[model samples]
Target: GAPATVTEQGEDITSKKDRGVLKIVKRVGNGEETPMIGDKVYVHYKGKLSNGKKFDSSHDRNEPFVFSLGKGQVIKAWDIGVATMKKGEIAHLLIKPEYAYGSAGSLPKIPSNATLFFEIELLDFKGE
Candidate 1:
């Protein structure tokens, strides 16, 4: 599918639509297995604000983050974005504030109603 392009708050962003919640920047797998609800996934990720200021990075910790898909263990954008990914795939997700921290954002690092950018690499997953 062609990449979808749209302007958000006057900034032009390009991404591939996946599940309507995320704009996936890269997809690195074609295998049959994809993470679903109730599956546990291990991933490495870097999160940044719109201006490219990084907020968090798993690479800095030298470890992957593990969480169960669609289980509310992570942010809403993560749940929606990672659900469409396959093991061994890497993707960049552009998430709208509504799908992220919303009006009352995560303090200190993230501000209110901020859009988020995440580069995610799916290492593996355990499906039930």
Candidate 2:
């Protein structure tokens, strides 16, 4: 099935000037507040290459991945994608190479200059 497209005031994911990154909202959440720079977030995600080869999945471990926003604890794509989510929301992010592993890439797992895709769910978070 095709994913639900994300829409916001005066902007949609496809309309963004930065064509390298795209966010698709699958489910909306009730949480009113979005994460801030110093907040800690809990999420479950599956990461894949552009060819649909999965490299990692937090769901396989039955544990949520935790990271601090704006702390550079994760990939740039994640930092940008996750920050726009609300608690309980599920979204898909299509990240270009520059926002992902970049030219060097994560050897053995991800190839150089590879585009990545991720399905991420914001389970919960702690504000700064």
Candidate 3:
């Protein structure tokens, strides 16, 4: 809902930082394909507070989070951020309230207006 701080590493790869999703690449992927709607996607990820304590994680969770891209399976920041990724690409996302839980916050852990930090790894996608 507003503009953001700039970092040489931060990019609005989805062209949506005006709506509050900042993507900073961690690892680059050599894969030539980006996911599309109807594609099956799997990713490894962790959600952290500004304090850096993890609230959710897939690290050693024994399985990746799976979903179909572009259908908005969860937070729009996640879908928008992950949709821009290719296999093996890892990105850190800063998601503001509007793209996250908004004023409603999240159950038990996340607080209202809390900015979310997510580290996401695009494992792979299956598509025709």
Local distance difference test scores for all models: 0.72, 0.78, 0.77
lDDT for model 2, on a 0 to 1 scale? 0.78
Question: Residue 2's C-alpha lDDT in candidate 1?
Answer: 16
- Candidate 1's TM-score reads 0.79
- lDDT by residue for model 2 over 1-128, one digit each (tens)? 22223212112243246656678778897668988888999999988786766568998899999999988899877877788898999888877787889999988888899987788999998976
- How far residue 71's Cα lies from its native spot in candidate 2, in Å, is 1.0
Q: 1-128 in candidate 3: lDDT tens per residue?
A: 11123233467654643847788777898668888887999999888764554478887788999998778778888878888887899888887788888899885677888788788899999984
Q: What's the true lDDT of residue 6 in model 3?
A: 22
lDDT of 1 at 56: 82
State which candidate, 1 or 3, has the greater lDDT. 3
Per lDDT, the best of the predicted structures is: 2
Better of 1 and 3 by TM-score: 3
TM-scores vs. true structure, each candidate: 0.79, 0.85, 0.83
- The residue pairs that clash in candidate 2, if any, are none
Q: State the TM-score for model 3.
A: 0.83
lDDT value, candidate 1, whole model: 0.72
Q: What C-alpha RMSD separates each model from the true structure? A: 5.4, 3.7, 3.9
Runs of candidate 2 exceeding 4 Å displacement: 1-16
TM-score of 2: 0.85
